[PDB]
Amino acid sequence: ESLGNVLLVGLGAVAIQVALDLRRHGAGRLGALNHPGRRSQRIAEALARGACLQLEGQGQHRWLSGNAALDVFHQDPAELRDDWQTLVLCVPADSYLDVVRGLPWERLGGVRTLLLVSAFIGANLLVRSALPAGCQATVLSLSSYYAATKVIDETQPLRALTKAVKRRVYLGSSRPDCPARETWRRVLAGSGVEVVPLATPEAAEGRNVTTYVHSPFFLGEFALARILSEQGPPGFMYKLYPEGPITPGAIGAMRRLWCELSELLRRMGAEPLNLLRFLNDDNYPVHETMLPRASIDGFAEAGAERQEYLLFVRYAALLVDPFSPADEQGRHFDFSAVPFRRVSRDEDGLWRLPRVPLEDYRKLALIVALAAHFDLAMPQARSLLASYENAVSRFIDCQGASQCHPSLYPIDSRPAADAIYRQWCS
Amino acid sequence: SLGNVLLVGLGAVAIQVALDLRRHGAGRLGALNHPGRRSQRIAEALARGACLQLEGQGQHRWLSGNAALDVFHQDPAELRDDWQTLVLCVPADSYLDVVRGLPWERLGGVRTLLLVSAFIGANLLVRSALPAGCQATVLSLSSYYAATKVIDETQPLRALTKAVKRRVYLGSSRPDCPARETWRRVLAGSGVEVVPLATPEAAEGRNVTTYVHSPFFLGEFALARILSEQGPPGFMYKLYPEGPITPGAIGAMRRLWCELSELLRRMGAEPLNLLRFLNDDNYPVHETMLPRASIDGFAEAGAERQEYLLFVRYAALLVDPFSPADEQGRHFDFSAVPFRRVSRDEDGLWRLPRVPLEDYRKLALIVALAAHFDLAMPQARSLLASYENAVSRFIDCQGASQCHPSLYPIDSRPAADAIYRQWCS
Ligand SMILES: NC(=O)c1ccc[n+]([C@@H]2O[C@H](COP(=O)([O-])OP(=O)(O)OC[C@H]3O[C@@H](n4cnc5c(N)ncnc54)[C@H](OP(=O)(O)O)[C@@H]3O)[C@@H](O)[C@H]2O)c1
Numbered sequence: 008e009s010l011g012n013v014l015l016v017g018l019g020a021v022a023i024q025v026a027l028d029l030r031r032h033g034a035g036r037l038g039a040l041n042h043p044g045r046r047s048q049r050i051a052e053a054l055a056r057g058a059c060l061q062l063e064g065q066g067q068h069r070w071l072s073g074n075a076a077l078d079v080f081h082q083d084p085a086e087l088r089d090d091w092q093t094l095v096l097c098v099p100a101d102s103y104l105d106v107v108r109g110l111p112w113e114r115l116g117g118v119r120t121l122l123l124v125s126a127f128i129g130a131n132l133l134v135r136s137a138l139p140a141g142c143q144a145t146v147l148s149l150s151s152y153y154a155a156t157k158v159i160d161e162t163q164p165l166r167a168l169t170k171a172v173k174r175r176v177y178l179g180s181s182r183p184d185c186p187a188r189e190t191w192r193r194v195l196a197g198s199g200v201e202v203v204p205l206a207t208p209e210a211a212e213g214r215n216v217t218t219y220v221h222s223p224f225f226l227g228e229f230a231l232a233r234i235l236s237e238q239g240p241p242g243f244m245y246k247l248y249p250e251g252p253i254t255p256g257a258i259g260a261m262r263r264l265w266c267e268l269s270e271l272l273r274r275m276g277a278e279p280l281n282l283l284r285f286l287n288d289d290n291y292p293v294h295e296t297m298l299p300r301a302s303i304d305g306f307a308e309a310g311a312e313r314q315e316y317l318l319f320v321r322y323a324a325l326l327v328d329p330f331s332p333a334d335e336q337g338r339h340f341d342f343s344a345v346p347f348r349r350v351s352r353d354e355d356g357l358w359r360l361p362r363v364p365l366e367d368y369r370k371l372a373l374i375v376a377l378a379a380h381f382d383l384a385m386p387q388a389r390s391l392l393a394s395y396e397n398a399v400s401r402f403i404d405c406q407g408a409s410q411c412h413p414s415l416y417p418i419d420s421r422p423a424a425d426a427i428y429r430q431w432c433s
Numbered sequence: 434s435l436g437n438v439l440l441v442g443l444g445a446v447a448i449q450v451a452l453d454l455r456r457h458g459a460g461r462l463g464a465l466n467h468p469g470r471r472s473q474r475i476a477e478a479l480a481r482g483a484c485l486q487l488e489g490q491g492q493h494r495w496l497s498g499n500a501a502l503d504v505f506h507q508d509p510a511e512l513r514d515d516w517q518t519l520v521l522c523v524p525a526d527s528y529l530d531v532v533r534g535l536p537w538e539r540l541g542g543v544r545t546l547l548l549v550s551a552f553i554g555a556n557l558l559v560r561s562a563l564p565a566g567c568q569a570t571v572l573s574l575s576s577y578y579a580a581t582k583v584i585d586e587t588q589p590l591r592a593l594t595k596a597v598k599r600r601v602y603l604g605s606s607r608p609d610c611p612a613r614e615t616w617r618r619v620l621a622g623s624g625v626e627v628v629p630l631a632t633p634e635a636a637e638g639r640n641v642t643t644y645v646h647s648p649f650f651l652g653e654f655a656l657a658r659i660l661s662e663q664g665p666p667g668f669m670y671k672l673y674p675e676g677p678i679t680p681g682a683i684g685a686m687r688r689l690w691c692e693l694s695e696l697l698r699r700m701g702a703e704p705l706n707l708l709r710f711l712n713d714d715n716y717p718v719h720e721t722m723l724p725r726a727s728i729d730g731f732a733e734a735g736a737e738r739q740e741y742l743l744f745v746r747y748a749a750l751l752v753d754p755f756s757p758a759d760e761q762g763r764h765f766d767f768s769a770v771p772f773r774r775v776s777r778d779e780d781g782l783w784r785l786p787r788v789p790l791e792d793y794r795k796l797a798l799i800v801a802l803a804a805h806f807d808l809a810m811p812q813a814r815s816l817l818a819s820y821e822n823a824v825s826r827f828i829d830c831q832g833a834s835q836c837h838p839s840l841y842p843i844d845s846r847p848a849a850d851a852i853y854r855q856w857c858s
């Protein structure tokens with residue numbers, strides 16, 4: 008009714024979870040669009056043999072396992088007609104501009120809402136800048152994807168596993184006092200996530216967890232050395248050095264970037280967040296023994312030294328899951344044993360980067376270019392961008408430009424940042 | 434210059450020391466071990482031809498050797514005045530008892546007494562028990578310099594050394610002392626560096642256990658594991674909830690280090706930089722985790738930074754950062770040292786492990802001593818109270834008749850008073 012017929016744009020891990028939540032609520036017709044490729048070919052094959060979307064919850068999340076039917080799947084936008092009231096962008100956030108430009112808007116006049124499932128600062132404005140003149144669609148920004156979900160087996164592209172669910176995410180809208188926010192609150196509540204509506208898109212985008220966490224940890228020297236490796240151990244994303252990238256220097260980068268992003272938010276009329284309380288209360292907690300409530304609530308007024316200490320403790324306390332059951336010797340589950348994905352050759356033989364860190368870099372590069380329009384230099388952010396750029400440049404030097412996909416090459420974020428700022432000022 | 438050497442307490446430490454003494458060059462080698470089952474096994478083994486046998490493990494294979502024991506005694510009254518050097522290889526809590534038990538009025542030939550694991554005040558305590566004319570020099574070693582155990586008690590004189598420390602410290606009751614240089618060389622044969630210091634208390638203040646075992650293993654988490662009989666033992670060097678290390682425990686560590694450092698200053702000893710001591714004398718971490726400038730600057734950093742650095746140090750050593758990585762990139766889990774827990778002895782009585790019994794006894798003495806220097810040591814006293822309350826509840830539950838008397842309350846004030854009187858003399 009407020010959702011009508013819903014078109015999922017991108018049909019990967021996020022889309023399958025979102026589809027299960029939409030089918031619980033009642034989506035009218037549910038369709039999906041995914042650009043041509045091996046995945047789309049596999050999806051069409053599975054749907055044609057009668058398959059449905061399948062979502063399995065892992066461990067304590069087993070309760071939300073379910074199946075969802077898809078009414079239509081398109082890998083060719085030419086077949087789309089004006090049948091859709093809601094678009095849900097489940098593609099990577101670094102592709103939002105391309106994907107919105109490529110939609111056949113001449114056949115989508117009935118679209119009333121467009122939801123960005125993993126927004127970042129400026130994404131709402133960027134998407135609006137790409138919409139056709141007079142477009143009626145309200146654009147909604149969800150702060151972060153609300154779970155951890157993976158397609159287990161790429162040969163069963165319609166089956167996903169959700170292994171964590173966040174406690175709270177945030178939702179803003181390009182329409183003031185938007186009623187679609189409540190609809191989406193209900194949709195995500197079905198999986199146990201609390202959606203907090205905020206007054207502007209940028210306030211919600213300022214609560215994108217990966218911008219704060221992936222930037223300092225996965226744009227630094229250790230992560231890049233693992234990711235750009237073909238031999239040797241991949242290491243682990245959330246372990247301490249030398250098993251993973253977390254060091255006191257990375258934590259200092261995290262604090263300083265949070266300060267920079269907070270000032271940008273204030274210049275865009277959004278209230279910044281308390282980083283420690285956000286991580287602990289909205290994403291995943293630790294015991295009071297490790298992070299006392301008074302320290303969590305007081306974090307924004309603590310000194311820089313105390314802030315870095317608390318952030319380090321937070322990540323050290325989650326090397327194992329402190330709430331998991333202990334085994335016979337007293338060990339808890341190794342929560343930080345997610346390995347780094349590394350560079351790999353595509354079907355044209357060209358090196359490609361994994362989404363961590365390519366998407367992380369592209370998001371932060373756009374944010375820095377936007378912040379320039381607000382006379383903010385963002386030196387810590389620029390240091391992280393430079394670390395990535397230098398590491399990827401050395402990789403190209405060693406492997407040969409001939410062997411590298413052009414996504415590894417230098418980009419220019421200034422045009423998109425200019426479009427965002429113009430939309431802002433309009 | 435060593436002359437004839439009597440090893441008091443013929444256990445693991447003594448067997449390592451005996452072989453180091455023989456490598457250097459000494460006279461007759463004797464031992465005194467108090468009556469008990471171990472002494473009975475030693476006496477039978479010696480009767481059947483046994484000798485002291487040291488095995489070095491792995492890279493320390495070259496420490497392996499045999500040494501004959503020339504004399505074995507159980508009764509201190511049976512000692513002849515034939516000994517120039519005594520080495521105390523018993524638990525440090527027994528040093529006073531051992532010294533009080535020796536017939537010093539007919540041991541005028543003793544020139545040197547070495548305390549292998551000297552706590553703060555041990556040198557003074559030992560000297561307070563000596564007769565007025567006694568001219569023995571007392572040496573304090575900061576800690577035992579290896580890791581050594583008797584493999585099997587059925588072969589009671591055969592010990593295994595698995596590791597040797599980088600560095601220990603040695604002080605003497607005699608200013609600018611020469612037995613001091615001899616023992617520097619003796620112990621150096623094991624590969625340890627002995628650093629001579631100008632007073633005994635300077636060496637006594639450089640034992641890692643005083644600074645680390647007190648905050649970590651006298652707290653609530655450690656005591657709950659140690660006093661448990663069922664459930665997992667947990668791990669001594671892991672973070673909560675797998676082990677006792679918390680920001681609160683690290684704050685206790687910093688505060689206790691400050692208290693101990695001021696006591697050392699009032700006793701005329703230069704205190705230590707805790708983080709530099711841990712990194713350089715116990716086990717290092719990479720510059721990425723603890724920059725050298727942060728290590729060297731630790732003593733002048735603010736309290737908040739000091740706690741952060743200490744927390745990082747222990748988090749960084751949850752795995753061994755210098756071990757070889759496996760195929761995924763994991764390093765060896767050397768923090769998974771299980772807690773030893775209460776055990777019933779031969780008579781059926783509950784006993785505490787040496788960690789934390791020995792650590793509590795040492796800190797109880799230190800606090801009583803510090804009172805004479807007008808130092809209240811509130812952090813130390815909080816750790817003492819934590820132990821006392823937990824052990825008292827254990828006795829309540831199990832029954833005093835089921836508990837070894839070493840669990841019952843102690844009073845360290847008499848020893849502290851003897852130390853302070855000796856220091857003032
Ligand atoms: N999954 C999580 O737990 C999680 C957590 C945090 C954040 N997120 C964010 O959510 C977003 C989607 O994640 P996901 O795991 O669902 O990714 P996914 O499983 O890889 O699915 C992405 C979908 O979009 C298509 N796609 C990828 N790049 C595209 C492009 N440039 N243009 C058009 N379509 C494209 C993909 O098809 P092809 O493969 O054929 O290209 C695929 O169907 C990412 O930004 C992610 O960082 C996800």
Ligand SMILES: NC(=O)c1ccc[n+]([C@@H]2O[C@H](COP(=O)([O-])OP(=O)(O)OC[C@H]3O[C@@H](n4cnc5c(N)ncnc54)[C@H](OP(=O)(O)O)[C@@H]3O)[C@@H](O)[C@H]2O)c1
Nearest residue numbers: 442443444445446466467469471523524525527577580581
């Ligand atoms: N071995 C190491 O690697 C190591 C490392 C660090 C610190 N230390 C400390 O150094 C001290 C000695 O260690 P250790 O491993 O050699 O202990 P150990 O193997 O138990 O040997 C102690 C020896 O001294 C005897 N003994 C105890 N009290 C005595 C007394 N009042 N008079 C005469 N003999 C006595 C013991 O006989 P009974 O068994 O019959 O009592 C035993 O033979 C201990 O407190 C230890 O905590 C040792």
